[PDB]
Amino acid sequence: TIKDVAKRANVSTTTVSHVINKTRFVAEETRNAVWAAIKELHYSPSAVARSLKVNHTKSIGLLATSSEAAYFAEIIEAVEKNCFQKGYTLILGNAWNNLEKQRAYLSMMAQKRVDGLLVMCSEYPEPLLAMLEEYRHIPMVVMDWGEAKADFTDAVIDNAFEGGYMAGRYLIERGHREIGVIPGPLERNTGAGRLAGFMKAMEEAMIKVPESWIVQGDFEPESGYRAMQQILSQPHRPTAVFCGGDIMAMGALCAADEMGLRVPQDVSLIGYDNVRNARYFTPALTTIHQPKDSLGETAFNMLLDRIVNKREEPQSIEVHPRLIERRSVADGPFRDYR
Amino acid sequence: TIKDVAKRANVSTTTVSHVINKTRFVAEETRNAVWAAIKELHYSPSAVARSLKVNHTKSIGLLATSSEAAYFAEIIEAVEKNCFQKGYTLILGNAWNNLEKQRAYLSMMAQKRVDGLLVMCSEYPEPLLAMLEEYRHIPMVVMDWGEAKADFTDAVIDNAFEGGYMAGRYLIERGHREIGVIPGPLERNTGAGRLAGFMKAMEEAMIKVPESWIVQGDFEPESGYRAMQQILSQPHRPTAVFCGGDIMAMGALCAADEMGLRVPQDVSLIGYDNVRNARYFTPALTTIHQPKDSLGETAFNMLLDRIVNKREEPQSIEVHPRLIERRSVADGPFRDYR
DNA sequence: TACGCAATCGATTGCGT
DNA sequence: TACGCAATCGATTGCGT
Ligand code: HPA
Ligand code: HPA
């Protein structure tokens, strides 16, 4: 088809090319003629032909976990923004935390020869770790670790620990001493990390959280429900609860409200993520806000760097969470005694 | 690189090829040798080289509006599922309801030569309509119209009208006669369509909704807030409100709760979408459920059809909404008089 | 029997004139 | 000056032997 244009415009295709990419000077008329032909033939040059020659497809692969989850969703849209903004195309793939699915996705990506890879798999067993290395040749950045687990990738790090710590303290400083927690999967950073940060703050306070008061969630609203329910279901109940993520949090609000418990008057609840619509939770949710957009953009940027500036040494950028006060938290019994 | 494999295995590349795609019989040993080389060289065959020859990239383009919105998000994940399931790769692009962005996205897609196109642009002005036709050559299906607006595409249709109608009736049959509505953008199907279905039911009932009682939303929680607020802010207030989408609905719950209004005891609220986490709204939201997954899959399927079975005649499949009773609705003053 | 030769898909780009 | 020739990127596939 490029031959077709050339022919119409009676010039070599080489010409057609250069004019199409202003890659060397071309006589006005000549230029015009080509643009003309280009238009009548209704010409769209093949990127694949081009990619074949130039050796990069101007496309990036996002090997994600799930894309419906608010948290996820939000990050993704960000990344997309950035890609578009710099001419990259997004290939979205969800491995659902399934090795086989992930091996598959990975392979198609290499095959389609994505310029770089954005990795957000949530959990990282050695088998997953291993696979990834097999493709160290393709530039990648993991956006979901607590610290850098490998030498062959870039990494953006969220400080989940300090975020949890922030959550504990607030509660502490607000009058609370009987607290409970519903964490996300321990096999994840946003799970374990948050918990542990939250647990340090407690030890520092000589606060002991009885095990009947800690209940694992899976970042899903339903899990949030069940936990809150198992917590308030007990003889002795905490006066405040720290919930690992806003959506399970939202799940937690439901239950309370269902047993006729009051928020925050009967229970204060503090979340984690500051998801786009947390403010509209009821009550408006107080939570730790995670920089999702920066989290996206920042990742894209390291990728581009390696890609263009051909860096080879893995890097790692940290990002920081921060408390957002809404109305799901109330003074605790010890506020006055501080 | 295919030459590299061949050489290692001392066979023509033609061989390497056939064994790689079991496209003709090959001596075991021969086969083995190639697999061997394939492994040592750590070989991944280029899809782009391949695509160049075979003429289809096994990739599909989703020209969407926004991907963070719950409704959207949910559909997208679906589509992705389907693509993966049949070896297609997803290129996600969000035009934000911006012509220029959409022209751009469209063009890159043609260029990257996507096998087909999934279209979800929300609003369709002639300029957008026009652009689309320009690419009638690439197979596409619009997943967001009320009826088929063009002869060059397939279309999946949701019955937003009958959905709205269902919403009105329920309210009617539940004792209500003073109702208000906060619709989404009229420039959209899920906006206008829902409204009108909802408005028919009302006329049929000889119910008149005073204009101070209808307030436009933009499908976003914030909009939901403001509207509900403007509605309950009045001297005379409805006893029931129909909200165009679950997220604005959620927005509506906030406000009420903020002015100390009760749901559903002071106001019944019925939504639209049955978004994944509507049940965990508080109270659990009664709403019309839209078949998102079928909406996805069904679209993918028409695409594949045109694609593979090389159909040429546009088709159109309808899908159906259905009421889901939760707890945001209460009997109205006229329930007993029916 | 089981395999290979050579042309081809659509672009780009180094030498030249 | 302003443009063109021919080789090339990595695969596939129709004829043959
Ligand atoms: O893995 C996760 N899933 C959903 N929401 C989350 N918020 C933090 N981590 C997660
Ligand atoms: O355009 C829309 N946006 C968000 N949610 C929606 N639910 C139906 N239509 C829409």
Side-chain angles (χ1 to χ4, degrees):
Chain A
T1 216
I2 202 185
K3 279 99 128 187
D4 315 323
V5 200
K7 196 108 58 179
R8 195 92 164 50
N10 349 95
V11 296
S12 100
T13 38
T14 306
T15 278
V16 168
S17 159
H18 285 280
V19 3
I20 244 33
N21 340 242
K22 347 205 129 298
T23 185
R24 99 187 172 178
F25 168 98
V26 182
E28 234 199 277
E29 16 170 8
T30 292
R31 208 194 293 122
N32 301 150
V34 181
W35 267 135
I38 278 267
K39 300 355 210 118
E40 307 156 349
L41 267 21
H42 250 86
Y43 178 72
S44 160
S46 150
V48 38
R50 167 169 242 259
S51 290
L52 189 48
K53 245 250 123 166
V54 292
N55 236 96
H56 63 256
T57 71
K58 229 71 155 30
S59 306
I60 104 96
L62 179 29
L63 178 45
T65 297
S66 146
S67 86
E68 198 268 345
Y71 174 81
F72 290 139
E74 275 185 60
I75 285 195
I76 272 139
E77 228 195 46
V79 161
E80 108 93 2
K81 273 211 226 221
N82 286 273
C83 291
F84 180 56
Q85 210 248 318
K86 318 261 172 175
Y88 279 67
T89 225
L90 222 225
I91 292 184
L92 180 58
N94 290 139
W96 289 95
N97 227 191
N98 176 111
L99 211 5
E100 247 66 58
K101 219 134 140 193
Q102 30 182 57
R103 73 149 65 283
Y105 261 134
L106 268 169
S107 127
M108 351 204 22
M109 293 188 172
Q111 283 182 196
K112 288 242 172 88
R113 296 285 191 266
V114 297
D115 288 349
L117 224 27
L118 255 21
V119 184
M120 218 187 343
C121 297
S122 286
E123 321 171 347
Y124 296 71
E126 237 280 290
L128 192 246
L129 274 263
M131 223 136 92
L132 295 177
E133 187 155 11
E134 302 226 80
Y135 298 85
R136 50 132 42 77
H137 72 287
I138 133 66
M140 89 214 232
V141 12
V142 176
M143 323 167 46
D144 59 15
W145 288 342
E147 74 274 5
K149 274 94 115 349
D151 46 289
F152 54 101
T153 343
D154 274 4
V156 31
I157 106 98
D158 69 8
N159 284 289
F161 181 88
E162 71 130 342
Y165 189 85
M166 288 182 76
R169 288 283 341 139
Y170 185 74
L171 285 189
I172 266 145
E173 295 186 350
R174 281 266 270 165
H176 306 277
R177 289 218 103 232
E178 272 152 300
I179 303 158
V181 44
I182 293 164
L186 300 200
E187 306 97 75
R188 282 126 98 127
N189 185 46
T190 36
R194 286 166 196 203
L195 192 42
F198 173 82
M199 214 62 21
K200 126 117 344 226
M202 298 290 131
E203 321 249 287
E204 276 184 345
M206 293 214 356
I207 294 204
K208 64 300 130 176
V209 19
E211 62 139 62
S212 68
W213 275 6
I214 116 285
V215 209
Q216 258 283 216
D218 58 4
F219 283 121
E220 301 261 81
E222 174 86 281
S223 87
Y225 193 98
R226 269 82 120 112
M228 205 26 150
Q229 178 182 282
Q230 259 177 54
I231 280 105
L232 312 159
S233 248
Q234 37 209 251
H236 196 202
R237 115 177 12 142
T239 85
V241 148
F242 170 37
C243 188
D246 296 358
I247 314 273
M248 279 184 338
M250 109 147 6
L253 269 18
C254 218
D257 165 281
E258 317 221 312
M259 1 236 284
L261 244 31
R262 239 326 228 178
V263 192
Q265 323 86 344
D266 294 319
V267 239
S268 305
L269 182 28
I270 182 191
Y272 207 128
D273 282 7
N274 188 20
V275 137
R276 259 214 260 305
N277 52 210
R279 177 225 179 308
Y280 298 122
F281 282 16
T282 269
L285 196 64
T286 299
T287 190
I288 310 304
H289 159 89
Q290 163 115 108
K292 294 154 260 111
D293 5 77
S294 4
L295 202 168
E297 145 185 299
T298 279
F300 191 51
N301 301 331
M302 288 165 87
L303 204 47
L304 233 48
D305 183 45
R306 271 206 170 205
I307 285 156
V308 5
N309 313 335
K310 262 185 77 223
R311 153 157 62 79
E312 270 281 284
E313 324 88 60
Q315 206 138 271
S316 109
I317 294 150
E318 286 189 3
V319 65
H320 301 270
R322 89 187 180 241
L323 192 276
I324 306 274
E325 281 176 271
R326 226 86 73 150
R327 331 207 355 286
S328 56
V329 178
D331 281 336
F334 305 76
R335 208 220 75 63
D336 296 323
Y337 302 73
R338 274 187 84 247
Chain B
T1 216
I2 202 185
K3 279 99 128 187
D4 315 323
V5 200
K7 196 108 58 179
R8 195 92 164 50
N10 349 95
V11 296
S12 100
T13 38
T14 306
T15 278
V16 168
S17 159
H18 285 280
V19 3
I20 244 33
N21 340 242
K22 347 205 129 298
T23 185
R24 99 187 172 178
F25 168 98
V26 182
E28 234 199 277
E29 16 170 8
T30 292
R31 208 194 293 122
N32 301 150
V34 181
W35 267 135
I38 278 267
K39 300 355 210 118
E40 307 156 349
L41 267 21
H42 250 86
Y43 178 72
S44 160
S46 150
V48 38
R50 167 169 242 259
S51 290
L52 189 48
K53 245 250 123 166
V54 292
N55 236 96
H56 63 256
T57 71
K58 229 71 155 30
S59 306
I60 104 96
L62 179 29
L63 178 45
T65 297
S66 146
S67 86
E68 198 268 345
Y71 174 81
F72 290 139
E74 275 185 60
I75 285 195
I76 272 139
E77 228 195 46
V79 161
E80 108 93 2
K81 273 211 226 221
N82 286 273
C83 291
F84 180 56
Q85 210 248 318
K86 318 261 172 175
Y88 279 67
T89 225
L90 222 225
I91 292 184
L92 180 58
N94 290 139
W96 289 95
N97 227 191
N98 176 111
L99 211 5
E100 247 66 58
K101 219 134 140 193
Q102 30 182 57
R103 73 149 65 283
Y105 261 134
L106 268 169
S107 127
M108 351 204 22
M109 293 188 172
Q111 283 182 196
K112 288 242 172 88
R113 296 285 191 266
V114 297
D115 288 349
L117 224 27
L118 255 21
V119 184
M120 218 187 343
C121 297
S122 286
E123 321 171 347
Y124 296 71
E126 237 280 290
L128 192 246
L129 274 263
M131 223 136 92
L132 295 177
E133 187 155 11
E134 302 226 80
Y135 298 85
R136 50 132 42 77
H137 72 287
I138 133 66
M140 89 214 232
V141 12
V142 176
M143 323 167 46
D144 59 15
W145 288 342
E147 74 274 5
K149 274 94 115 349
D151 46 289
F152 54 101
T153 343
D154 274 4
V156 31
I157 106 98
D158 69 8
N159 284 289
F161 181 88
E162 71 130 342
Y165 189 85
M166 288 182 76
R169 288 283 341 139
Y170 185 74
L171 285 189
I172 266 145
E173 295 186 350
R174 281 266 270 165
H176 306 277
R177 289 218 103 232
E178 272 152 300
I179 303 158
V181 44
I182 293 164
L186 300 200
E187 307 97 75
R188 282 126 98 127
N189 185 46
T190 36
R194 286 166 196 203
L195 192 42
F198 173 82
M199 214 62 21
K200 126 117 344 226
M202 298 290 131
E203 321 249 287
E204 276 184 345
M206 293 214 356
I207 294 204
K208 64 300 130 176
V209 19
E211 62 139 62
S212 68
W213 275 6
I214 116 285
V215 209
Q216 258 283 216
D218 58 4
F219 283 121
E220 301 261 81
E222 174 86 281
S223 87
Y225 193 98
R226 269 82 120 112
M228 205 26 150
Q229 178 182 282
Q230 259 177 54
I231 280 105
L232 312 159
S233 248
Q234 37 209 251
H236 196 202
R237 115 177 12 142
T239 85
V241 148
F242 170 37
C243 188
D246 296 358
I247 314 273
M248 279 184 338
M250 109 147 6
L253 269 18
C254 218
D257 165 281
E258 317 221 312
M259 1 236 284
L261 244 31
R262 239 326 228 178
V263 192
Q265 323 86 344
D266 294 319
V267 239
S268 305
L269 182 28
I270 182 191
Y272 207 128
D273 282 7
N274 188 20
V275 137
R276 259 214 260 305
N277 52 210
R279 177 225 179 308
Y280 298 122
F281 282 16
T282 269
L285 196 64
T286 299
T287 190
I288 310 304
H289 159 89
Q290 163 115 108
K292 294 154 260 111
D293 5 77
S294 4
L295 202 168
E297 145 185 299
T298 279
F300 191 51
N301 301 331
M302 288 165 87
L303 204 47
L304 233 48
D305 183 45
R306 271 206 170 205
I307 285 156
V308 5
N309 313 335
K310 262 185 77 223
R311 153 157 62 79
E312 270 281 284
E313 324 88 60
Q315 206 138 271
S316 109
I317 294 150
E318 286 189 3
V319 65
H320 301 270
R322 89 187 180 241
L323 192 276
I324 306 274
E325 281 176 271
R326 226 86 73 150
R327 331 207 355 286
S328 56
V329 178
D331 281 336
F334 305 76
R335 208 220 75 63
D336 296 323
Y337 302 73
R338 274 187 84 247

